[PDB]
């Protein structure tokens, strides 16, 4: 079928930071709809917007995925007829993508069979799994005190320069390379060089066979990206993993670094949307945003997704709303302490503050 609002024309009415209001004469399209700015505006790259609110029957507020430079009022905008869709399938394996699903590896066209929207509903109760098993990482502290669960959710809470990234690479080397299933690396608000290093590492290990079959997909929206992209790259990366889990019944690894930047990005836009801030200054919808995102990261009866998420603790304050709300969404919690690292102990895991769900004799020996 074809959307009834595709090709709908609107005009820019207000611009503030990364937030833009669009007035449509025939009626504002549905929320989450994608729009493209048609006016040249002397820009160097295209401008795309995602609707997030409805101000009235004709006006809609949107967030821009690229910088809003050289954007004037009355600029012409055209609806794309649907939400932001990204490629899926084996064609994406061995490739690097951005929030919009465009390949940035400067290689041949993806040629995907189809695309799927980033925004989707989570698995329901009847589609939940009941399999508990130990994922052996090779690290003593993790395998002993807070063992990880296959198909489960794992979080690495840590400050700045504590070792979150290092542990993720160690897990990738010790698990992903010797993994039968597929892997998806979602970089969110992290150093661009780290993505380049990972890409080189995956090519050297031949997990990406440029000429052969690959087992890894990379999706990267980094620090330099505007808040709009950093708030949706995780959805796009998760969408690809969902397709592998369901449409193929294949086990997937999902390495997200860092998930805190996702909440931070939504906070930045929320301030511009005209919403009353909650404690600290975060958006009032902090918990809901994480809930919608995390609930999609789960293992169903069709397939399994083992997720490892890095969580950044601002100012080393573990009581911050962002990391605090994330504890309830994780099967395994790995807390890192700066003082332990300063004592020469690596990894800096604080076992007393760590926890696991499979620490049950009915599961482990």
């Amino acid at each position: 079928p074809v959307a009834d609002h595709k090709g709908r024309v609107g005009h820019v009415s207000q611009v503030i930071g990364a937030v833009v209001d669009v007035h449509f004469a025939d009626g504002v399209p549905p929320v989450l709809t994608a729009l493209d700015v048609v006016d040249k505006l002397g820009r160097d790259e295209p401008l795309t917007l995602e609707i997030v609110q409805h101000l009235d029957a004709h006006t809609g507020r949107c967030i821009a995925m690229q910088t809003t430079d050289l954007l004037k009022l009355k600029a012409k905008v055209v609806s794309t007829g649907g939400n932001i869709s990204v490629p899926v399938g084996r064609e994406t394996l061995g490739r690097i993508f951005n929030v919009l699903g465009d390949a940035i590896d400067q290689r041949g066209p993806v040629g995907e069979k189809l695309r799927m929207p980033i925004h989707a509903v989570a698995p329901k109760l009847a589609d939940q799994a009941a399999e508990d098993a130990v994922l052996t990482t090779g690290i003593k502290v993790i395998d002993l005190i807070l063992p990880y669960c296959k198909g489960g959710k794992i979080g690495l809470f840590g400050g700045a320069g504590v070792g979150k990234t290092v542990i993720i690479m160690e897990l990738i080397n010790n698990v992903a390379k010797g993994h039968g299933g597929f892997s998806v690396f979602a970089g969110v608000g992290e150093r661009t060089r780290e993505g380049t290093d990972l890409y080189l590492e995956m090519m050297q290990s031949k997990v990406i066979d440029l000429k052969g079959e690959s087992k890894c997909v990379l999706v990267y929206g980094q620090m330099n990206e505007p808040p709009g992209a950093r708030a949706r790259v995780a959805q796009s990366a998760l969408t690809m993993a969902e397709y592998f889990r369901d449409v193929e019944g294949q086990d997937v690894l999902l390495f997200i670094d860092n998930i805190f930047r996702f909440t931070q990005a939504n906070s930045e836009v929320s301030a511009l949307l005209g919403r009353i801030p909650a404690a600290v200054g975060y958006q009032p919808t902090l918990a809901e945003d994480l809930g919608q995102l995390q609930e999609r990261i789960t293992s169903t009866t069709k397939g399994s997704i083992t997720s490892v998420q890095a969580v950044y603790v601002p100012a080393d304050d573990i009581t911050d709303p962002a990391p605090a709300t994330t504890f309830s969404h994780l099967d395994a919690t790995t807390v890192l302490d700066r003082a332990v690292a300063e004592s020469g102990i690596y990894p800096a895991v604080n076992p007393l503050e760590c926890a696991s769900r499979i620490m049950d004799p009915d599961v482990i020996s």
Binding site: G274, I276, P277, G281
Partner: protein
């Protein structure tokens, strides 16, 4: 004594900032909810 004093002086600074932020958030909320009515003045005679 030098480590608990810093946490005491760091806490008072944070406490002052947060309390003030709360009050201003309420002030902005009550300002935002307010709406100006139609201005009943002799606009033509301008």
């Amino acid at each position: 004594q030098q480590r608990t004093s810093s946490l005491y002086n760091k806490t008072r600074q944070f406490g002052i900032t947060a309390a003030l932020i709360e009050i201003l958030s309420a002030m902005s909320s009550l300002e935002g909810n307010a709406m100006k009515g139609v201005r009943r003045n002799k606009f033509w005679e301008g």
